[PDB]
Structure 1
């Protein structure tokens, strides 16, 4: 019945069967298909959080609220128990990336900074950037509310001028939104998707974001189109994904929001309720 999760599993099956074995920039083996497309229903509260292997929902929500704050300090995310960007903010990692003058935790002008302060001069994570640069997220909300048919509703982190300053160049590269029949849809262009760990997390993230923007705009939700450039499996995740591919998906969970949430900046962890997410056991995929 969950046909949409079966699409993700069929993508993994297709990559394992037909993908090219290529060593990546780090020298580790991947299995790669370039150019994949899948669509997930977001209708009636549905968020595409995989049921065949637990997704780190606490991490998804805290990472997204941290993006929305325009925050680039890994320590703020780590304080909430979410360690996913800690390696990239470490003294060692910063020094090896030629960021010796940066304080530990400073990821540079990554997603959140580009979303809220696009084009502002980065001067470290501790600087107050309020009303500096272009607030793409506020601008997209203004387009959805005032000009829902716009072909120009784009949220991008691909700031070429700032790529050299970033801990990591963005993998979830841009998202386009559209309104039809009072339903908000999202097309996510992901230049690079690790099908094991990254892609399930990223699908949950943009599904949730689309629901949050729809909530703020008083709209229903439509679909999430997921466009992949390099859709890949790490060679050391193949056995884990073969275990997952034996599992039959359950119905995706739904999200509901609590309280008076007027703007995109008014969401809290407590305001976001995930309903009926009881996934099958987590499968360890290291890195």
Structure 2
């Protein structure tokens, strides 16, 4: 879902508990019920640990592979659902998603042609722009990259982003705040926490900084009715110490990171939970 001292995981569990006791019933787009709270934040340190949640096994290899696909700016689904309605027959066969996802991170606003076209120098590269500013002005308060839900792009002019990520630099540490307009607490939030924390380590590595904190803010923080019973069970589990993330080579540019450059260590989560 990345476009579409007390243990830090206690924040997450406390937020689950708060939505369960205090959330109000509210329908999503499809008319499916949620318990919802408006406005929440949590901070997770990245210093010498990596916030892969331990109360359930998080799909780390999937976090990593989806982020690397976003970074590459891909619109080929094969390299890796109402917006599909706006695609032609021929093109959604072959896996062409149109100008969506990492296309906005790397080529925001470029005239789209096809998923095998050459978009070098076309549109705003938000990602490289973030990295260049970290290097030219670390005090900058504008070090911001947004992601859109693909469904929204042709829906209106100036469509609101889904997520905005702000970076912040001080004492040679890089920190990241991700504000998401809505957050599926059971499924999306853990995956997103790992995803933006991983991006934070990648760019700290290339800019020669140290990871600092990851802050997650959310608008409509919600639990799907279906997820209530498994989440109640996850709450009674005790967090284990966060693992470490180790980058195994010196890497010079963002586009040069490969999935096997990363190693997670000392990850001992509780068993997987399947959320509908």
1:141 aligns with 2:131: yes
1:7 aligns with 2:20: no
Question: How much has 1:94 moved relative to structure 2?
Answer: 6.2
Instruction: Provide the rounded CA distance (Å) in 1 between the counterparts of 2:116 and 2:83.
Output: 16
The answer as to 2:107 corresponding to 1:103 is no
**Which runs of 5 or more structure 2 residues have no equivalent in the other structure?**
none
C-alpha distance in 2 between matches for 1:165 and 1:122? 17
Q: CA RMSD in A?
A: 2.2
Partner residue, 1:180: 170
Pick from 74, 85, 96: which aligns with 2:77?
A: 74
In structure 2, how many angstroms separate the alpha carbons of the residues matched to 1:277 and 1:188?
24
Q: TM-score, normalised by structure 1?
A: 0.88
Q: Residues of 2 paired with 1:121 and 1:161: CA distance?
A: 17
Q: How far is 1:261 from its partner?
A: 0.5
Query: How many residues are matched?
Result: 268
Aligned to 2:64: 61
Alignment of 1:215 onto 2:218: no
- Asked if the contact 2:34/2:224 (under 8 Å) is kept, the reply is yes
Q: Given the superposition, is the C-alpha separation of residues 185 and 94 from structure 1 closer, same or farther in structure 2, using an over 3 Å criterion?
A: closer
- Is contact 2:83-2:151 (8 Å) kept? no
* Distance in structure 1 (CA, Å) of the matches to 2:78 and 2:160: 19
What is the CA distance between 1:148 and its match in structure 2?
0.5
Which residue is 2:31 aligned to?
A: 27
> How far 1:278 moved relative to its partner?
1.8
Contact kept, 8 Å, 1:34 with 1:231, in 2: the verdict is: yes
Q: How does 1:1-287 map to 2 (within 5 A)?
A: 3-44=7-48, 46-77=49-80, 88=81, 97-101=85-89, 102-104=91-93, 105-158=95-148, 163-164=153-154, 172-286=162-276
